Amino acid sequence: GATNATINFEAGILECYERFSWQRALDYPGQDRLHRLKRKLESRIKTHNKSEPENKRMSLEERKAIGVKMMKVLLFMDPSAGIEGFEPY
Amino acid sequence: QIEVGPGATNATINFEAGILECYERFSWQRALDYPGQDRLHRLKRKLESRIKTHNKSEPENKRMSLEERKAIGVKMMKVLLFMDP
Ligand SMILES: [Br-]
Ligand SMILES: [Br-]
Ligand SMILES: [Br-]
Ligand SMILES: [Br-]
Ligand SMILES: [Br-]
Ligand SMILES: [Br-]
Ligand SMILES: [Br-]
Ligand SMILES: [Br-]
Ligand SMILES: [Br-]
Ligand SMILES: [Br-]
Ligand SMILES: [Br-]
Ligand SMILES: [Br-]
Ligand SMILES: [Br-]
Ligand SMILES: [Br-]
Ligand SMILES: [Br-]
Ligand SMILES: [Br-]
Ligand SMILES: [Br-]
Ligand SMILES: [Br-]
Ligand SMILES: [Br-]
């Protein structure tokens, strides 16, 4: 529910920790935090997906893309994936 | 783990202050379940403590409040949000 939405949002959040860690900006307790979040969302995704029909199931990967989009919208940024898609103004 | 420089302390505080801002924005979608609300409140509480401790560890002209650090965090979040590996 609010559980699905919250999972997808948290999957975007995870993707951002990951991107930041890739750029060597995430500190060591931050990377512990990233590992806890990934394990926790994995277990939460397994459970949520097990309680829905086949066609209402989504991998972590798909969900990350959903949460990244949510994050863009909330921060008032163009919602399109990737570096392509900006408007001029 | 990934090896990082001393710059990552402040960067991670700023980053996480951007994260917190996002949770806060998402919350106003009432889309945030109880474990999500607890994660947000705990984030804010721990970040305030880290900010106070880090600021107390720095000159004065480098000290920054939570609201200033969120502003830095959101700047970083634009860059990150549009470069997908
Ligand atoms: Br959603
Ligand atoms: Br450290
Ligand atoms: Br932490
Ligand atoms: Br993604
Ligand atoms: Br903003
Ligand atoms: Br934009
Ligand atoms: Br898209
Ligand atoms: Br779009
Ligand atoms: Br993206
Ligand atoms: Br890209
Ligand atoms: Br537009
Ligand atoms: Br490394
Ligand atoms: Br550094
Ligand atoms: Br920074
Ligand atoms: Br978080
Ligand atoms: Br809340
Ligand atoms: Br706040
Ligand atoms: Br300050
Ligand atoms: Br403040």
From Swiss-Prot, chain B:
Gene name in the database record: NS
Job description of the protein: Binds and inhibits the conjugation of the ubiquitin-like G1P2/ISG15 protein to its target proteins. Since G1P2/ISG15 is an early antiviral protein, NS1 may inhibit the host antiviral response. Prevents EIF2AK2/PKR activation, either by binding double strand RNA or by interacting directly with EIF2AK2/PKR. Also binds poly(A) and U6 snRNA.
Sections of the chain in a coiled coil: none
Cell location: Host cytoplasm; Host nucleus
Protein name: Non-structural protein 1
Phenotypic consequence of residue 69 to A: Complete loss of dsRNA-binding and inhibition of IFN-beta promoter
Region entry G1P2-binding, spans: 1-85
Record motif Nuclear localization signal, residues: 42-47
Domain comment (free text): Both N-terminus and C-terminus can inhibit IFN-beta promoter activation and IRF-3 nuclear translocation.
Highest taxon, organism lineage: Viruses
Entire-sequence positions represented here: 9 to 93 of 281
